[PDB]
Design a protein around this ligand. Structure first.
Ligand SMILES: [Cl-]
Ligand SMILES: [K+]
Ligand SMILES: [K+]
Lengths: 144, 138, 137
């Protein structure tokens, strides 16, 4: 269809991650960026979303010490060793709590063809209940 | 052209701290929008409530509220409590956020099997919590 | 469809600070001409965040107090070997760099007591860059 008016483009792609540890941060920034480039959309938004209740999406600086701090703080906050009521059923209440607070998604601007983000703003999958063989991240670009 | 669709969910809350599952209502609105590919924004225009997503299991729901309470400290002499007694609710809402955004893909709200959508009430009872639901897409 | 961008630049004076940017965001929504859509407010920084809550000076103090307590500026975080701001990264990681508001019938949809703040956790900084994008019809 040869459009003649500005119109909404929506482009989807998917990133899969296998996680090795119970708590893990996995940098997905370059994969998200490649999908933004692949979309051909110049101006819009990029939604990065996990359909998982024991993982999350965050954005911060890729420095190995900090990554350890992030996971240490998440662990302290969620209390994996606590007798949460959900642990009667499962053993991952802490993971659900972390994900609930952190959120399943982050939204970035896409501008003049580029993901808008800081020099030290990388995108991470936050695993709180690994190892998992398949964490699925949806990447959606929406715009012109 | 593009499509933007709005609807509204109104919820009365009974307890000071409460989780209210609105998954079905959000799904209905996605369906009624007719939008096949886009996004679904679920947003509360309230500073003492929030929108979260996680598993509808009643133990976990208790856990979430317990954690929120412990984190926000309702009994603490926060400075806002000089004006009114709900500083904790503001803090929890600040941290949790007023909105969540979900993909809409091939006509369906994209969400996990154990990912339900909740209004988080931190200062109830309230007669009217207003959730805006917006679907934007093609 | 229409997509409109503008920028807010904020200089911050204190290590921890909330700066209300509500009016500026509103101005940008107005200027976009967009009637129905979304408003993204995004900070391209890892030691800052965007939140929304009530502009009451006591509560503002409480928010920052809670953030400081949660993030522990005095703790020997591993990142602090490199720069003394691990607490700021932690707060930003939890709070998030973006908020998304509806725009409806030409108005930013928000509550009476829902103001939009840049959260500075590693000030003073001469330039915090906020992108505001309005997308809609
Ligand atoms: Cl046109
Ligand atoms: K579980
Ligand atoms: K209040």
């Amino acid at each position: 269809i040869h459009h003649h008016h500005h119109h909404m483009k929506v482009y989807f792609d998917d990133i899969y991650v296998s996680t090795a540890r119970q708590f893990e941060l996995v940098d997905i920034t370059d994969q998200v960026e490649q999908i933004v480039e692949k979309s051909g959309i110049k101006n819009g938004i990029c939604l990065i979303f996990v359909a998982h209740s024991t993982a999350a999406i965050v954005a911060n600086e890729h420095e190995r010490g900090l990554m350890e701090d992030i996971l240490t703080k998440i662990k302290e906050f969620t209390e994996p060793s606590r007798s949460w009521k959900h642990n009667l059923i499962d053993d991952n209440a802490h993971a659900h709590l972390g994900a609930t607070f952190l959120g399943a998604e982050r939204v970035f601007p896409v501008r003049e063809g580029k993901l808008v983000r800081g020099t030290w703003q990388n995108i991470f999958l936050v695993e709180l209940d690994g190892p998992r063989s398949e964490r699925h991240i949806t990447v959606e670009i929406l715009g012109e």
